[PDB]
Every structure is written in structure tokens, then in C-alpha cells.
Symmetry: C3
Subunit: 266 residues, 3 copies
């Protein structure tokens, strides 16, 4: 109803025993630096992936809301963004399998959607689920990207800066709560991206999320291109900041906040 199983079904074959981890990367909720969507597209570009299930966008999408992009060329509609919301099996650089659910966060039917996904985690013997978030924070581009973690399998992440807070709901948050309630392992990882940079792609944040997954799911992920991309935008941001004194004042101010907060947390 929510989704359709691919035929024939791809095999999730671990030469490694123990269930795969599931990575949830839904675009439309917390997309600072485009880090969440950049995470899934990067893995898809660099690794062998196979489609397991496609969700039905007619059950799930408010299209006047999303207006999937159309290409007109040679005077005809040549292309419309399909906005695939799909479950994949992806092989890391050792061919170790993991699962990815990526695409648009649904507009609709969050209850049925999260039940569908929980059914899928049971069907594929998933042992951990990690959801990805990218949040704009009062931080400078001159300090390391911080990740915070919530959930019951947070222990698996070695680089982590983790009080009571109230946030707008998201499909992935409903999903986490449902997994928790069912006694399954589940975390959400949120990368903190400088607010003055959140509207644009910010590769350091994508890198940080992917490093967090590589570490806690024990995956061998190819991340060197994103390191170079991060180098580039950083060199770029440094000109923009050195060619102006008022920006140069905010960054020092934010660095001080960060370094002072760093001691406090340590």
C-alpha cells in the first residue's frame, strides 16, 4: 500500500553475519548545508546500490508543495524529477551491505509510513537504524563540524558532542519513537552547520555525517572527494571573510563562543 517490493528482490548477502544497519536520509526537514540529501546522493554515486522498495508518491506527497522539477529542451518536456523514496541495499568498499532509505520526507500518512518502514526493518533483519539531520547553528566555519546524537544506540558513535528540547515533528522522528517503543536500536545524528552558510551546500557537514555512519556502522565509505570539496568551500569562505571586516567580527565572536563552550562541555 505504502510501497512496492522490487522484482526480483536483491539479496542482502553479508559475508558478514549479523543484520545490516539502516540509514534514513529524508530530505525536507533538516537540510542545512544540504547535508542530508548530499549524504545519500554521494553514497549512491560512489557505491553499488540496488533498489529493494519504492514508496507510492501518490499516498505520500503534496505535489503543489514539492513541484518536482521539470526540464524542457528541444521544445518539449524531456524530464520530470521522479522524487524516488526508496529502500536500497548499498555495498561499501569491502562489499559489506547496508540499507538506505532516502528521498523526500513524506508530506502525508506519517503513521502508515513509519509502520511500513518498521515492517521493513523486521523483514530485512535490520539491527540498527540511524536517521540523519542537518541543523543551522550559531557556529563558525572555522571550527570543526559538531555532531550530536539521540537514541539508544548512541554509544556506537565515537565523535559526539552530547538537554531537554522541543522541536517540530518529522516523519523520521515518528519513526525513531516507534522503533524505540518496539525495543529496537535507533539513533538520530544531527550535524551543526553555521547558520550563515546553511542555505548553500556545505560539504564538511556531509562529510561529518558520513564519517559518523562509517564509524558507528563499521563501514568503509569513500569520503576523500568530499574532503576535497570541503577544502574548496573553506578556502572560498576564507576569502569572502578576509575581504570584509564586519563578517570578520562575527566569526571571531562565534569562535570565542565555540572555544568557551568547548571547555565548559569538557
Amino acid at each position: 500500500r505504502m510501497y512496492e517490493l522490487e522484482y526480483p528482490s536483491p539479496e542482502v548477502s553479508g559475508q558478514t553475519a549479523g543484520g545490516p544497519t539502516l540509514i534514513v536520509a529524508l530530505q525536507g526537514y533538516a537540510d542545512a548545508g544540504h547535508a542530508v540529501e548530499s549524504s545519500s546522493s554521494h553514497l549512491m554515486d560512489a557505491l553499488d546500490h540496488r533498489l529493494i522498495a519504492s514508496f507510492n508518491n501518490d499516498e505520500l506527497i503534496d505535489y503543489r508543495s514539492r513541484r518536482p522539477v521539470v526540464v524542457i529542451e528541444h521544445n518539449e518536456v524531456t524530464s520530470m524529477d521522479e522524487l524516488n523514496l526508496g529502500l536500497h541495499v548499498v555495498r561499501d568498499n569491502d562489499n559489506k551491505p547496508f540499507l538506505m532509505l532516502s528521498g523526500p520526507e513524506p508530506d502525508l500518512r506519517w503513521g502508515d509510513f513509519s509502520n511500513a518502514v518498521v515492517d521493513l526493518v523486521e523483514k530485512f533483519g535490520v539491527e540498527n537504524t540511524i536517521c540523519l539531520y542537518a541543523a543551522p547553528m550559531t557556529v563558525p566555519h572555522t571550527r570543526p563540524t559538531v555532531v550530536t546524537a539521540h537514541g539508544n544506540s548512541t554509544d556506537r558513535l565515537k565523535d559526539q558532542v552530547s538537554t531537554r528540547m522541543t522541536v517540530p515533528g518529522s516523519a523520521s522522528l515518528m519513526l525513531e519513537k516507534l522503533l524505540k517503543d518496539k525495543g529496537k536500536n535507533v539513533s538520530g545524528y544531527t550535524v551543526h552547520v553555521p547558520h550563515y552558510v546553511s542555505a548553500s551546500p556545505y560539504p564538511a557537514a556531509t562529510l561529518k555525517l558520513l564519517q559518523s555512519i562509517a564509524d558507528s556502522a563499521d563501514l568503509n565509505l569513500p569520503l576523500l572527494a568530499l574532503e576535497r570539496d570541503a577544502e574548496k568551500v573553506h578556502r572560498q569562505l576564507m576569502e569572502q571573510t578576509e575581504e570584509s571586516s564586519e563578517i570578520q567580527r562575527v566569526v571571531g565572536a562565534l569562535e570565542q563562543q565555540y572555544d568557551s563552550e568547548l571547555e565548559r562541555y569538557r
Copy 2:
């Protein structure tokens, strides 16, 4: 569209005759937060039992609403269920009435208003009252007015509802009103008028007004006293602010004049 609660609550009734239904849907006319405050006040203050729960998967655009989630101790501890439910509520004398409250549906207004009419039949409801709070050009320094529309408006004694022809944006409750009418049923909509410049923050005098209009026309005994305290406290914050400013004092006095003038026209036309 909904699920009936099991085991069902026995909504009688001795107290002969059918209950009235109160419709308090958040998302349409929420000036001073007065619709949601009315229902949540009754819920906190009176005994209530759940009768039916609507299915949010049929009814809600969750990316528009984003029901709030709490994270504490590195754990997702709660998520607002956004329950749109029908309740049996009992006043201070244990007299039953019905309340439909929760979010105005984003979707399926046709199936929704039809499901609601099957429920009013199911429960032998005899009158339906929908609540609205509108921002108006009225001052905080004058009593809160409620206007009425429908076919059972007669049951509301105090209502400065000198009306003409107007076109408003549609709502799920207005659709439901039109369907109850067309089906031959008793239905009214009460709008409380809230100073426009205070409409974004809680304005308890309006909640109070909506509730006493309901107590009046449905013959209910409601505990209202915490809302009186609240109203006096917001009034004082408002006095203090208008006090600081001659520009604001000028704006309030002009609304006061407008208000008094229309009140004259109203009593002249309503001996």
C-alpha cells in the same frame, strides 16, 4: 475516517433529551488562541471520556503541522499525537455534552463533514455549535463581543451580531455547518472578536466569552474562574503598555469610540 472507542462510553442522560455538540477546531480562526484554549480548558477542568478518534493519516498534512516532539536525556521522549477526537464531557452538575476538538483537517473535508454528521445522528445530538476567534477592530478596553450565525442562534441572549453579507475563506467547520443546515439540523457558529493588535498572543477574555456563550445556550455549568484571573492579568499587561504610549492611547480611544458608536446602533435596532 474515525474509530469508535471500545468499550464505548455511555453518554446518558437523565438529563432527558439530546446533548449539544461543541466543535473547537484549531487551524482556522485562532485569534487570541481562544478556540484551542476553550477546549483545552474544559478538558483540564472537567471529567471527559473519549468516544471516537479520527485518523490523522486520512486528514492531516503532517509537513504543514509537524506535531511537536520532545527530546530529553538524549532520547525522543514524546510526540504530540494531535488527536482530533469526539469526547463526552460532564459539567459541574455531571450534565453531559459533546466536544469535537483537535486540529482542523487539512484533507477530505467532504468525508470529514459527512463522518461528523453520522456521529451527531449516532449520538442523538440536538444542536451543534462551532467556535471561531477573529481578529477585529475592537479595543482591549471594552467587553469581548460574540456574533452568531446559523439556525439556532436564538439560544444565545448576548450577541452583538448585527450582520450583513460577507465572503470568508472556507473551513472544515463551515462546510460542516452548511451540511447540517442542508440536512435540516440545528447548527450555529459563534465568533468571538479579539483586538487585532493582541491576536497573536493568548487573549483569555475571548476564551471566557466563548465558554460563557456555550454555558448560556447549552445550559451548562462550567468552572470558569481561572480564566477570569488570567484575563485580568493580561488586561493589566495591556494597560501598562498603552500607558507608556500616546500613539497607542490614541489608537485605543479611536477603537473605543467606534465600539461605543456601534453599540448605540445595535441597541437602537434591538430594543
Copy 3:
């Protein structure tokens, strides 16, 4: 299928001309500069005999809190609620030649189902060509002729058009999904986009409506009554000519656009 209900009894669709009807698609909510899409359907509906063939189910298609269809309260009663009908009609021109029109709200929901349903109706009624209508805010002055561009595969039916053209990315619409589906099924389909002065776009611009309906009249070979739009265009133009001499900043903005236009009118042709 669940998207719509066929009217019963079924209206008369046949004409005296061989080959099937042209279908005009006019969905409000996507490209509405000058209100020219919605004025296209309602101008024709007011002028011509029309008959309902099918209504789409708004509960399947509509986010009502985003549309909030207008309610009339008078004599302290709810008298009226806009039904926001999305309907397929058979319309007759002034020679009584039939054509088809799908008009009303662009759906919020179920674009895949919606466009499959429309293709079904296209086949059921032997539609030979489908034209979708768009009105876009553009950097053109109100002092120069309104232009239409066309994209699709039946584009040549339209004599007077500044298309063709080349590569662009636009937000998607229900009519764009449908165009693509009709293209992928080997059918005839075009989209006509009227260019409306950006500074005038939030208000009615009848000249845009007129250009749209003339484009249809020429390319579907329909005898459409359009004179009332010429008179509406005159009224709105005068009102704009007045507004242009009361304000001197407005005159520079218009004067700049005028040359941008007239240049590229010659420069690139």
C-alpha cells in the same frame, strides 16, 4: 478512475467535423499571471454552450486548508460554499463545433493518478490534441503586444508564437506531468505560455487571456467570441496608461522594458 465521476446521462460529444476534439487544459494554481488561465476557462464557459462530462473528486485531489474554498455568509446564515469544481466539459463554438475543456483547481494531491485519469478520458473521447495553458510573469512592458511561447509536439498548429526555444528548468505542475505522459504515450500535446508584465501579474490582464484564447482558436480551428476581452483589454490599458504618467519612476521602468523588448524583437528574429 477513483479520481472522477462520469456524468449521467452522457452529454453529446459529436460534431460535423471528422477527427476528434481538441482538449484544452486550464488548471488554476500554477501559472496564473494576469489571472489569464482561469479567465480563459470562465470567459469561454460564460459565452458558449457547455455540458459536464466528468467531475473530479476533490477529497482525493485537494488540500483544503491550502485552498480554503470561499464561503458566503448572509442573513446570519451559511448560504454558499465554493465547490471548486474540477471538471471535464464539452464546449460548443459559434459554429457549434465541439471541443473539450478540463478546468478548475490544479490538484494538490495524486498527480500520477490524476494524469493517468486524464489520459483515460483523452482515449475514451478520441481527443486528437491536448493544449495546456500557462501565464507567466515576464520582463515585458504593457505597452507592447502580448507574446505566447509553445512547447510540445503539435506546436506548428500555432502560427503566431515566438517559440521555439531551449533548455529550461521549471517547478513541476500537474499539467506538466500530464504533457509528459501524453508525450510518452505517443499523443499530440502542446503547452502555451502567455508572457505577462511582471509588475501587472498579480491583477487581471485581459490582453493575456485574449492572446491565450486566440492561440487556441487558431490552432484548434474554433470560432470563439473574443470581442469582450478586447474591450476589457482597452479598459485595463487606459488605467495603466494613467498610472504611468502620474508616476515618473514607473515611466523609466516601462521605458527600459520597451527598449529591451523592441531591441530583441528585431535583434533576435
